Amino acid sequence: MKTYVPKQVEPRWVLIDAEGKTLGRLATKIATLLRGKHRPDWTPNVAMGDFVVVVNADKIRVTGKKLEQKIYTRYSGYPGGLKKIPLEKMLATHPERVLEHAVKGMLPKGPLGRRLFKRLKVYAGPDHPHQAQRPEKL
Amino acid sequence: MKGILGVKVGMTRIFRDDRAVPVTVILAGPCPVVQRRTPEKDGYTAVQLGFLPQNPKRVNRPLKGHFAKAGVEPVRILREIRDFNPEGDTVTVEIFKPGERVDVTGTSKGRGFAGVMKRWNFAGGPDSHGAHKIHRHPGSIGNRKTPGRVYKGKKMAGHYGAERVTVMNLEVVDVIPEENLLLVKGAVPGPNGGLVIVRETKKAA
Amino acid sequence: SRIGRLPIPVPKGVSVEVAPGRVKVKGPKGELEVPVSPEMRVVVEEGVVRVERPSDERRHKSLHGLTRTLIANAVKGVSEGYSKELLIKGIGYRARLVGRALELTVGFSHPVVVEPPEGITFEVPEPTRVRVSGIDKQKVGQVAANIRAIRKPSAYHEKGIYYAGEPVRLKPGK
RNA sequence: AUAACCGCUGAAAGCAUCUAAGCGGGAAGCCCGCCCCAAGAUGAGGCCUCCCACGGCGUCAAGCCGGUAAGGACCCGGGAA
RNA sequence: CACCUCGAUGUCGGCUCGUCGCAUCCUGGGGCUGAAGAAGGUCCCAAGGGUUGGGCUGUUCGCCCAUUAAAGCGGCACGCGAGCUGGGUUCAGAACGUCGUGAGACAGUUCGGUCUCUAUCCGCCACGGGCGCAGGAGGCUUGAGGGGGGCUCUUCCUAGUA
Ligand SMILES: [Mg+2]
Ligand SMILES: [Mg+2]
Ligand SMILES: [Mg+2]
Ligand SMILES: [Mg+2]
Ligand SMILES: [Mg+2]
Ligand SMILES: [Mg+2]
Ligand SMILES: [Mg+2]
Ligand SMILES: [Mg+2]
Ligand SMILES: [Mg+2]
Ligand SMILES: [Mg+2]
Ligand SMILES: [Mg+2]
Ligand SMILES: [Mg+2]
Ligand SMILES: [Mg+2]
Ligand SMILES: [Mg+2]
Ligand SMILES: [Mg+2]
Ligand SMILES: [Mg+2]
Ligand SMILES: [Mg+2]
Ligand SMILES: [Mg+2]
Ligand SMILES: [Mg+2]
Ligand SMILES: [Mg+2]
Ligand SMILES: [Mg+2]
Ligand SMILES: [Mg+2]
Ligand SMILES: [Mg+2]
Ligand SMILES: [Mg+2]
Ligand SMILES: [Mg+2]
Ligand SMILES: [Mg+2]
Ligand SMILES: [Mg+2]
Ligand SMILES: [Mg+2]
Ligand SMILES: [Mg+2]
Ligand SMILES: [Mg+2]
Ligand SMILES: [Mg+2]
Ligand SMILES: [Mg+2]
Ligand SMILES: [Mg+2]
Ligand SMILES: [Mg+2]
Ligand SMILES: [Mg+2]
Ligand SMILES: [Mg+2]
Ligand SMILES: [Mg+2]
Ligand SMILES: [Mg+2]
Ligand SMILES: [Mg+2]
Ligand SMILES: [Mg+2]
Ligand SMILES: [Mg+2]
Ligand SMILES: [Mg+2]
Ligand SMILES: [Mg+2]
Ligand SMILES: [Mg+2]
Ligand SMILES: [Mg+2]
Ligand SMILES: [Mg+2]
Numbered sequence A: 001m002k003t004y005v006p007k008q009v010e011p012r013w014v015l016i017d018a019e020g021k022t023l024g025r026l027a028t029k030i031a032t033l034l035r036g037k038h039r040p041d042w043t044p045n046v047a048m049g050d051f052v053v054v055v056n057a058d059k060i061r062v063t064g065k066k067l068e069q070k071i072y073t074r075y076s077g078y079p080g081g082l083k084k085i086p087l088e089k090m091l092a093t094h095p096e097r098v099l100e101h102a103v104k105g106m107l108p109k110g111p112l113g114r115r116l117f118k119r120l121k122v123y124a125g126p127d128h129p130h131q132a133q134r135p136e137k138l
Numbered sequence B: 001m002k003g004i005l006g007v008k009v010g011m012t013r014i015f016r017d018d019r020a021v022p023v024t025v026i027l028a029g030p031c032p033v034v035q036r037r038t039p040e041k042d043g044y045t046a047v048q049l050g051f052l053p054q055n056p057k058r059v060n061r062p063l064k065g066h067f068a069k070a071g072v073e074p075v076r077i078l079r080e081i082r083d084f085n086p087e088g089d090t091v092t093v094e095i096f097k098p099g100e101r102v103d104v105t106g107t108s109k110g111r112g113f114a115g116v117m118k119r120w121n122f123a124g125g126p127d128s129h130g131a132h133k134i135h136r137h138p139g140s141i142g143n144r145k146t147p148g149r150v151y152k153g154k155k156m157a158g159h160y161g162a163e164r165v166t167v168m169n170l171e172v173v174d175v176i177p178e179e180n181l182l183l184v185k186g187a188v189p190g191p192n193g194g195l196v197i198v199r200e201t202k203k204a205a
Numbered sequence C: 001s002r003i004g005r006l007p008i009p010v011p012k013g014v015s016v017e018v019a020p021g022r023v024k025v026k027g028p029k030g031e032l033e034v035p036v037s038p039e040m041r042v043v044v045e046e047g048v049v050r051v052e053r054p055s056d057e058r059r060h061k062s063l064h065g066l067t068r069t070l071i072a073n074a075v076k077g078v079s080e081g082y083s084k085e086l087l088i089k090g091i092g093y094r095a096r097l098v099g100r101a102l103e104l105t106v107g108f109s110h111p112v113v114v115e116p117p118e119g120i121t122f123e124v125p126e127p128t129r130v131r132v133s134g135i136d137k138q139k140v141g142q143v144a145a146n147i148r149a150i151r152k153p154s155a156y157h158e159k160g161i162y163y164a165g166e167p168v169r170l171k172p173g174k
Numbered sequence D: 001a002u003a004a005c006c007g008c009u010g011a012a013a014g015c016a017u018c019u020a021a022g023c024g025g026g027a028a029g030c031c032c033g034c035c036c037c038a039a040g041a042u043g044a045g046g047c048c049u050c051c052c053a054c055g056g057c058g059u060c061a062a063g064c065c066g067g068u069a070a071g072g073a074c075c076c077g078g079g080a081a
Numbered sequence E: 001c002a003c004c005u006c007g008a009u010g011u012c013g014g015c016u017c018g019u020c021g022c023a024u025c026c027u028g029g030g031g032c033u034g035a036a037g038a039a040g041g042u043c044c045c046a047a048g049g050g051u052u053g054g055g056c057u058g059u060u061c062g063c064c065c066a067u068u069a070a071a072g073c074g075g076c077a078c079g080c081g082a083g084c085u086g087g088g089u090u091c092a093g094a095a096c097g098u099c100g101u102g103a104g105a106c107a108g109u110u111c112g113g114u115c116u117c118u119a120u121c122c123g124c125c126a127c128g129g130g131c132g133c134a135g136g137a138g139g140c141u142u143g144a145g146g147g148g149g150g151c152u153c154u155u156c157c158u159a160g161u162a
Helices: A024-034 A087-093 A097-105 C058-077 C138-150
Strands: A015-018 A049-055 A069-073 A081-085 A119-121 B004-015 B023-027 B035-036 B046-048 B101-109 B164-176 B181-184 B194-201 C022-024 C033-035 C042-045 C046-051 C087-089 C094-098 C101-105 C112-114 C120-121 C131-134 C161-162
Touching: A015 A024, A015 B004, A024 A049, A024 A097, A069 A087, A081 A087, A081 C042, A087 A097, C022 C138, C033 C058, C058 C138, C131 C138, C138 C161
Parallel strands: A015 A049, A049 A119
Antiparallel strands: A069 A081, B004 B023, B004 B194, B023 B181, B035 B046, B101 B164, B101 B194, B164 B181, C022 C033, C042 C046, C087 C161, C094 C101, C101 C112, C120 C131
16 A cells, blocks of 8 residues: 555646735745645645735735834845845835745745745735636635 | 937047047937837837948848838947937937037947956056066955855956947037037047947936 | 823814724814824713723823824814914024015025925014914924024024024033 | 934823824935846846748657748858957 | 864965955044134944055064045954065074083074976856757847945135124
């Protein structure tokens, strides 16, 4: 008796509102979905996941003083090439990217983790591309 | 934000008001706009331009008689004036009046593989006393075990020249609609006969 | 003792509209919207409006005084809220008026020209005294402030821009 | 947009207080602005214009072979490259 | 102290090339002053850029000349010898003082004294070849993201006014 493993599956989509949801707390689940650790056939080496579409991402909200105090850093390659960007600045310039970031860091590392991140499509404000099913999830 | 293509012709001096005024005459010929860009179809705003009418047909198959003013299609079309939306077709040197300040993009003479010291105006080695084959050389490039490597911008010798260069705030000394000339003072990049694009200044705009 | 976060307000030209986070005053001289805490109910009663705090911790107490006084000001606001006087002292120094704008000479090599912001009105009864008229209290006090900061009172002489009242000073000097 | 700082309005604390809720000023510094690179930005973007949807086997998931088409190369005369 | 390195981690200083820190020398912004003005003092913010040329000594440093907005202090194997130097130190010659009967010896001095064409990898400057960018082409261009840059003085008017 070997353990069951999926054959090629159907890539289910999912829709999320994010307006008012917190951040990392929204991120946690978006990760789980991305992996598909909610599916009972879950396989570590394959990624049968859900595609995730998230909207109203300009509207994520967060607690404490993070809007000012929380900094994203970017080292270029160069002397003094470390860039420091506050939350407010990000949201104002590229809204989302903060959720994209929070989720990315929560996905695993390596070839496959990088693939799952492609399956998370994040937009600012309402709507999005209407192709797939995208059952709204709350 | 007015702009027009041209070719560096040569330099001379002008004697204006008992002063010398060295000048670089660039010829900016009539410039047959062959396309426009719109925040609708494009997402920004500019004009394609086109210059130097020649070829009978080397133009082959992809082309525009779409804007059709490309009649006598031009060798170099070099295009964006960025946010410029001119009067009708065909911008001329009428565009500029004398005493106007202008920025000029052009292609700097290629020096090919050029030492540090002429690339970077390094000091080089002494020509005597100890000497030993480092006269023209760069020196140390780094420290020791830390960082144990070379910084990512580190000035060294490589191809130098033959690049984009825009010398800014040049004064328009004269413009001669007759032959499509234009006279600015000084710095403008690159060889006689090379292409230059000529824009209004960014001191004010 | 007997802390001023819960006395009562006032009537008679004006309306009070409690919204969840804000209250709208709207009286004979104009209308003001007072942002208030989302928590902390403000109740309108007969000819008076009260404010009550949820808890007894210093967090709601501190918000309590503030909120009462914030509203009250908007009521004092929409009936005669302007004041803010400013007399100019010292020799070459005089104030003139230009249209709605205010031009003063405080001893720079230029005149200084101040346009009034929205809902603020300038008056110059004598060249040496000024008046800033307004509905909004904090905005009056600021505009007043801003004027006085061009040439603030000297320590060594009476020259400057003085809030009326605001006593004078001597170091002396040499 | 901020630093130190200067202020407004303002409680907790009847007074007072630039601060606890707010707001305004405020640096050669910060973010833009200028100049240059830049879609291997595998998140490979967009616009204009071209050529066209053959013939056989693979009766199918991609293809394959032969000419082709728009176009390129090659070779040659050269170049402030 | 004796922990990696004695089947080798080249040692002072210079030069070249920098990059970082800020406990800031200057420039910018500030509070206090026993701040009249000008000019200082002290303390706070600020690392963007700047931060001279000589005499002496191997010198670092220091002293001095002449200037300056200023003539900052540190780190990077007391940064940097497969980059250069080789004056110092630090082999073998020779001398002085001194010590030793002596051979010899001295963080004492003196003069002299071999510094190794070829870069595999990483890193760095440049420049191409390949494939990808799921129809192929010729033009044109958006800019995510990077990099460059960022100094300062005198005089004059205001006004010989405050
Ligand atoms: Mg050349
Ligand atoms: Mg050079
Ligand atoms: Mg030389
Ligand atoms: Mg030689
Ligand atoms: Mg070495
Ligand atoms: Mg390292
Ligand atoms: Mg502030
Ligand atoms: Mg007060
Ligand atoms: Mg009070
Ligand atoms: Mg506050
Ligand atoms: Mg501001
Ligand atoms: Mg500057
Ligand atoms: Mg470009
Ligand atoms: Mg591409
Ligand atoms: Mg493309
Ligand atoms: Mg040991
Ligand atoms: Mg032991
Ligand atoms: Mg050893
Ligand atoms: Mg070894
Ligand atoms: Mg060795
Ligand atoms: Mg400091
Ligand atoms: Mg100062
Ligand atoms: Mg003074
Ligand atoms: Mg001071
Ligand atoms: Mg600095
Ligand atoms: Mg001499
Ligand atoms: Mg000497
Ligand atoms: Mg010494
Ligand atoms: Mg010196
Ligand atoms: Mg240093
Ligand atoms: Mg040491
Ligand atoms: Mg060393
Ligand atoms: Mg050596
Ligand atoms: Mg080595
Ligand atoms: Mg020697
Ligand atoms: Mg020996
Ligand atoms: Mg003896
Ligand atoms: Mg000896
Ligand atoms: Mg010895
Ligand atoms: Mg000799
Ligand atoms: Mg020698
Ligand atoms: Mg290696
Ligand atoms: Mg390539
Ligand atoms: Mg950019
Ligand atoms: Mg930048
Ligand atoms: Mg004078």
